Write a protein that binds this DNA or RNA. Sequence first.
DNA 1: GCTCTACGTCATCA
DNA 2: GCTCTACGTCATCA
Lengths: 114, 114
Amino acid sequence: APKCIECHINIEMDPVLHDVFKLQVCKQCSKEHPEKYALLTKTECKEDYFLTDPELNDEDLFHRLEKPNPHSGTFARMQLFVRCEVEAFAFKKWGGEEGLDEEWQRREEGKAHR
Amino acid sequence: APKCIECHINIEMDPVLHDVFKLQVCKQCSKEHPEKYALLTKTECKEDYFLTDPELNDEDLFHRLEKPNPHSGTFARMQLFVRCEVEAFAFKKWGGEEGLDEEWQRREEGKAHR
DNA sequence: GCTCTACGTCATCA
DNA sequence: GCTCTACGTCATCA
Ligand SMILES: [Zn+2]
Ligand SMILES: [Zn+2]
């Protein structure tokens, strides 16, 4: 009777988190902890975490869910990533939340003087 | 008995020009007219004619000969292109020889000031 | 006189 | 709050 790792109560896991992201997390807990379980588009991963296309395109590094592009079925598929994996990678790359914020400040300056 | 299109005499065609570039040209005529038949590396194509990697990577646009990279067999293969095909594409792209030199003149400032 | 592309950005088009 | 890549550069690393 395997239980959700957040609540330890539910036995029915969120189908995407479980099947695509290998996380034994129920839907309710996923909505309760978006800090860990929210899905981010490829574009949002680049904005929020400063990850690059080669990193996000690496099939071996992140699990990901693809959907039809909401703008047209003929455009490139939308790619969804789970915040806990992307963040963990980004913390490693930039040095914790501190390093990430520092990079953000640096980026903000290049924005100001341009 | 088919003849070289430059001399109208030789029947033995240069093996590369014939087999890879589909040009019925003898080796001797090829050295007598480098303006048309000299082989240019991918890097030289970019320097000389300002073609881009997507143009030069298009399997459908240019014939090409590949060789082992002379720096190391483990590096990416050297790619050779025949001057008459690359020049002809470039004259379309930039508008003849004189559009090409205009672009040459233009770029000479971008690195002169920089 | 060798080739690939990320770099740090972004528009555009898809 | 969509994605891919050309931008023209070029330095590295292959
Ligand atoms: Zn739960
Ligand atoms: Zn000849």
